[PDB]
């Protein structure tokens, strides 16, 4: 049957919030809730070739701070910091010139075990007419070789352009979805194929969190150094 969202079930217990701010009134709460959505959607739908794993937003009465974790931040940086100013102006237009922007790019360590970029690669391969069995097999084998626990990939839709929708699942390793202690990262993406839309959902297991607390700690960004700038 239907299952609750893996991220939503674990939020507020073993996962911190992607946007951390306290608005003044109900009128401002909607504007701030929509502007952050616009910024995140921008960073995800465009500038996709940089493998942006996640973007967090942190706002005060008047100051906006953006933390963009990316696997290949060279594409965000551009040639001698060219596209950086373009995305800065895009964000400033999105929120407002009256505020102070503190954009900060962060190179994410051990990218392979991140469901967002795994799903994005899956969707890109699907859209590029790559055969599905080979695509999922190579993604699963590279994810496992990255040194993580089980990964479950569900790819549904008009499969290979067929007129009857199917679904194909590959679980390889233990994926306890009912357990709350487990560190399960879940992402979902849409491959826009010439025959319609394909939905790819990737669950990845990254061990068990044996330290009680609302995170306040990096999650698989720490194995190598996670120090990139563009801030003040």
């Amino acid at each position: 049957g239907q299952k609750v969202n893996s991220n939503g079930l674990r939020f507020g217990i073993n996962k911190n919030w992607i946007s951390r701010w306290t608005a003044n009134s109900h009128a401002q709460t909607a504007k701030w809730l929509i502007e952050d959505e616009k910024i995140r959607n921008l960073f995800f739908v465009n500038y996709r070739n940089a493998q942006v794993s996640n973007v967090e937003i942190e706002r005060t009465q008047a100051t906006v701070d953006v933390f963009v974790y990316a696997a290949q931040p060279a594409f965000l940086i551009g040639s001698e910091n060219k596209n950086i100013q373009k995305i800065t102006k895009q964000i400033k237009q999105i929120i407002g010139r009256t505020t102070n922007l503190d954009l900060t790019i962060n190179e994410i360590g051990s990218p392979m075990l991140s469901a967002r970029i795994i799903a994005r690669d899956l969707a890109n391969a699907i859209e590029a007419r790559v055969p599905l069995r080979t695509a999922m097999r190579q993604s699963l084998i590279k994810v496992l070789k990255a040194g993580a626990n089980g990964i479950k990939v569900l790819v549904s839709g008009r499969l290979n352009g067929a007129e009857i929708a199917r679904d194909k699942m590959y679980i390889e390793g233990n994926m306890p979805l009912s357990t709350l202690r487990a560190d399960i990262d879940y992402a979902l993406e849409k491959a826009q194929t010439t025959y319609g839309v394909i939905g790819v959902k990737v669950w990845i297991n990254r061990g068990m969190i044996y330290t009680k607390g609302l995170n306040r700690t990096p999650a698989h960004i720490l194995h190598p150094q996670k120090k990139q700038p563009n801030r003040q």
């Binding site: 951390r20 701010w21 306290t22 942190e58 706002r59 005060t60």
Partner: protein, 54 residues
């Protein structure tokens, strides 16, 4: 906040969400500049909200 799960029908199947505004109080008798200047450099995290009343 109670929200119906389904997109179209089945109002019976509905989930719930909560938001808690945890609140603490702390009153200082006499501070003076010697304490105020040190208090200036605290950098309270964004989630925390101050309601200083003088």
């Amino acid at each position: 906040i109670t929200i119906i799960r389904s997109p179209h029908v089945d109002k019976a199947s509905r989930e719930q969400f909560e938001k808690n505004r945890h609140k603490r109080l702390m009153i200082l008798v006499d501070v003076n500049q010697g304490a105020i200047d040190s208090l200036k450099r605290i950098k309270i995290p964004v989630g925390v909200t101050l309601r200083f009343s003088k």
